[PDB]
Specification:
Radius of gyration of chain A: 25 Å
CATH superfamily of the largest domain in chain A: Creatinase/methionine aminopeptidase superfamily
Binding site for Mn(2+) 2 (chain B): 277, 360, 402, 442
CATH topology of the largest domain in chain A: Creatine Amidinohydrolase
Largest interface: A-B, 68 and 68 residues
GO cellular component, one term (chain B): extracellular exosome
Number of domains of chain A: 2
EC number (chain B): 3.4.13.9
Structural class of chain A: alpha+beta
Binding site for Mn(2+) 1 (chain B): 266, 277, 442
Strand order of the largest sheet of chain A: 6-5-4-3-7-8
Distance between the termini of chain A: 40 Å
Subunit structure (chain B): Homodimer.
Bound molecules: proline, chloride ion, manganese (II) ion, sodium ion, hydroxide ion
Oligomer: homodimer
Helix content of chain A: 25-40%
Number of strands of chain A: 16
Largest sheet of chain A: 6 strands, mixed
Strand content of chain A: 5-15%
Number of helices of chain A: 16
Chain lengths: 481, 478
């Protein structure tokens, strides 16, 4: 069957991946007792956009649910699936003659049918007529709340849809649940995105020199992933104190610090291949040699990383892993002399959240922060740190998670803790003072839950010895200029 | 005063640039009979956006009119200018404490005042109260039609604005006209963007090898511009027949470059929201064939004829027609066409080979504002109707000059089926050029008192291009 491919050494992704997803969605819907026979799932693809009132185009990236179901890269499409038969129909725009001059060849419907391995292709302007001829009981459309953004999914609409019976409640939780569990075909893509990002991280570690701007390394990473991996979307490079800023690198903070001798670097890179994401973070000394303090903090996060990975298997409650990481960080910070006292009491006082204010990790898939973390019946825990978890679910096979503990020295959180007598007694101010401005360390792996444990997708140097050896290497193997 | 800078060898852009723009806008408004005392210009900045319903952020880029006036990179701002005094006030978001954890330091209002060299800074939620205290006669907001997209500019609005007198007709044509004429400070940025893009084009010409994918060169170009130029925002990379596809869209150009192909690399991007757009064409294998030399030198001739003719007072559509005539003459000189060139022009044959406009205003947007102000009409003829301006040239305008010749099957076939055009085409020679793709040579220029200032600096002659691709230093002169 056909595949998506960007040539060279990039991955061939079979269009069968999307056919399987369509089948899985139908199977799940057929089991839902509220679903009427003759129902048709209706999804609307993304459209091309421009910057404000200008004609400057914005890079088109397909909407994630639509991509999951169809793998279609073209703007302006819709896609429908007959629930009872699984039959798929793609609707493509009927394009003007002038498209041939400006945009490219005008493909036939048959070309798209072959390309996407769908059962039928029609033009978008005929969607009402085509759906009418099929005499559906109900159109199932997508509407629900994303629990990371709080946004409501945009429901499909077309001229004449008001003449149909439309349900916008059933679909969302079902398609979300399908997305939560990755098929073997999806896992092949995620292994590939991890391979490329892992190689690109190694290249950054080999290339970093004191005196460079953070964005110079961002640029190199993106160049590797695009030119060698076909990862066009490679869109957090934080040195020194910036490593404590959790989403550093936005327009408010555009990666323009000069990397200095003595800095810790935290390079968190997210990107995608054919709308399949990966998200990997490496931390390393800018000058290639960990100091004693850097080694201590780094190895504390290595410890929690590997303890969590070693504990993960089906039935494990993700908030328990978050609390495990907190406890280990507190133990290690006490060994370093930053903290003193009973670690049990530190945990009761939520001291771990002072050093790791974000969630331990999140579902990963078509979105970097993937859907389904908080389905109905799964509640967010209203405690420091835990409230930032992007899922409070128990692990099951096929889930793909980031595992991303970190320790940071964040002045406003440290200062709050020092003002609070329940927490201040644990903090040794004179030792802590030396770590003001340290920034932070985060170690982020992508893993898949298996029947008995996990499969680690990421492959980057991780021990102090491995990282120092990587950075000291002479073989960059790719020098642009 | 303060400047924007990305360190290393990147350009320091003084915030004084934006102060000058504010002053020029106020001076223009004061001469406008529709403008009364006590007026305040009110602009709303862009906000951060996300991908569909996800929390995936889209890289924030400031709205162009707001950038032109204020140079502000942060999302969520507003900006106002008292017309009578020129006094500027920037409104910035009042941030949540958690911003400090996730996004970075929460800067004081004083920090922003110093950073942007404005007269006052306030929080966005205080805008109604602050403007009420100034007792303005009228708020002048932005509303108008962009003549390239057809979109209507987004007018500022805030909670409480309905208690003010608002006019949304006066500002747009005036701020557009200010943008049309570049200041010396703006030209310094456009010289820089052209320098970086020109260097990146040279690197692509040096690196390109048969067998590469088009997107490998796109990637290399972007890497140069970002790592060496700080140009984070960068892109038609068309090999073989793809060079005839004018906007070949935002996805990887994934054709394998083949021996004998012509390449057309059209790159547009920006530094601190100031654009450049440069197109270079060259043979993939580094050696022009005779046919490739002929088509290429035809576009080189039109490029240079237009650049030599441009000066204040010239009507831009006349330059488009000059390019068409030169293309037709040269296509006849290579045997593709025969007959009278005067007759070919009368039949609009030039548009078969160049269906797009000769060139466009450039500035904060690649297709910059102000091409078709009130009274300036689009010419309803093939080719000319695609011009993005029909204005007369005046000093301070920045234009692209981008003639091209393409072999586009559906246009050639229309001409062959049209008795008014068919007899000019020699099928026996033309057949050799089917699938050739095309050549475009795009320079960025400033209109000056004496003619033009060429901003772009890339190899252009056949010999210069072959020398570049063979790895010669820039200083080498064939
Ligand atoms: O947003 C999140 O959940 C992770 C933790 C900080 C960086 N990315
Ligand atoms: O859009 C335009 O006006 C020019 C001509 C083709 C490429 N850019
Ligand atoms: Cl022919
Ligand atoms: Mn990350
Ligand atoms: Mn992550
Ligand atoms: Mn261009
Ligand atoms: Mn252009
Ligand atoms: Na190194
Ligand atoms: Na203490
Ligand atoms: O992350
Ligand atoms: O262009």
């Amino acid at each position: 069957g056909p595949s998506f491919w960007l040539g060279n050494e990039t991955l061939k992704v079979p269009l069968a991946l999307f056919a399987l997803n369509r089948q899985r969605l139908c199977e799940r819907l057929r089991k839902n007792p509220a679903v009427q026979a003759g129902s048709i799932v209706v999804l609307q693809g993304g459209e091309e956009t421009q910057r404000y009132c200008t004609d400057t185009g914005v890079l088109f990236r397909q909407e994630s649910f639509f991509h999951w179901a169809f793998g279609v890269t073209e703007p302006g499409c819709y896609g429908v699936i007959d629930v009872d038969t699984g039959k798929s129909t793609l609707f493509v725009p009927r394009l003007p003659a002038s498209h041939a001059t400006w945009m490219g060849k005008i493909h036939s419907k048959e070309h798209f049918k072959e390309k996407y391995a769908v059962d039928d292709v029609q033009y978008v302007d005929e969607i009402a007529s085509v759906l009418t001829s099929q005499k559906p009981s109900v159109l199932l459309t997508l509407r629900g709340v994303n629990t990371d953004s709080g946004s409501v999914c945009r429901e499909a609409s077309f001229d004449g849809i008001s003449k149909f019976e439309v349900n916008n409640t059933i679909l969302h939780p079902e398609i979300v649940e399908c997305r939560v569990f990755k098929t073997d075909m999806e896992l092949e893509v995620l292994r590939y995105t991890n391979k490329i990002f892992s190689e690109a991280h190694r290249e950054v570690m080999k290339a970093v020199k004191v005196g460079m701007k953070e964005y110079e390394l961002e640029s190199l990473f993106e160049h590797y992933c695009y030119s060698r991996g076909g990862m066009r979307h490679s869109s957090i490079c934080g040195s020194g104190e910036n490593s404590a800023v959790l989403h550093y690198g936005h327009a408010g903070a555009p990666n323009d610090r000069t990397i200095q001798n003595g800095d810790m670097c935290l390079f968190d890179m997210g990107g995608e291949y054919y709308c399949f994401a990966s998200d990997i973070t490496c931390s390393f000394p800018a000058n290639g040699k960990f100091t004693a303090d850097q080694k201590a903090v780094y190895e504390a996060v290595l410890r929690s990383s590997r303890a969590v990975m070693g504990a993960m298997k089906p039935g494990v409650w993700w908030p328990d892993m978050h609390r495990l990481a907190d406890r280990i960080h507190l133990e290690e910070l006490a060994h370093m002399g930053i903290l003193s006292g009973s670690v049990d009491a530190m945990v009761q006082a939520h001291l771990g959240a002072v050093f790791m204010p974000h969630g331990l990790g999140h579902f990963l898939g078509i979105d970097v922060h993937d859907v389904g973390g908080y389905p109905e019946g799964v509640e967010r825990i209203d405690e420091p740190g835990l409230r930032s978890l992007r899922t409070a679910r128990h692990l099951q096979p096929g889930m793909v998670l980031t595992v991303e503990p970190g320790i940071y020295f964040i002045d406003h959180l440290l200062d709050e803790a020092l003002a609070d007598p329940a927490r201040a007694s644990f903090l040794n101010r004179e030792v802590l003072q030396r770590f003001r401005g340290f920034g932070g360390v985060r170690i982020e792996e992508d893993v898949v839950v298996t029947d008995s444990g996990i499969e680690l997708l990421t492959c980057v140097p991780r021990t102090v010895e491995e990282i120092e050896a990587c950075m000291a290497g002479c073989d960059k193997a790719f020098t642009p200029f």
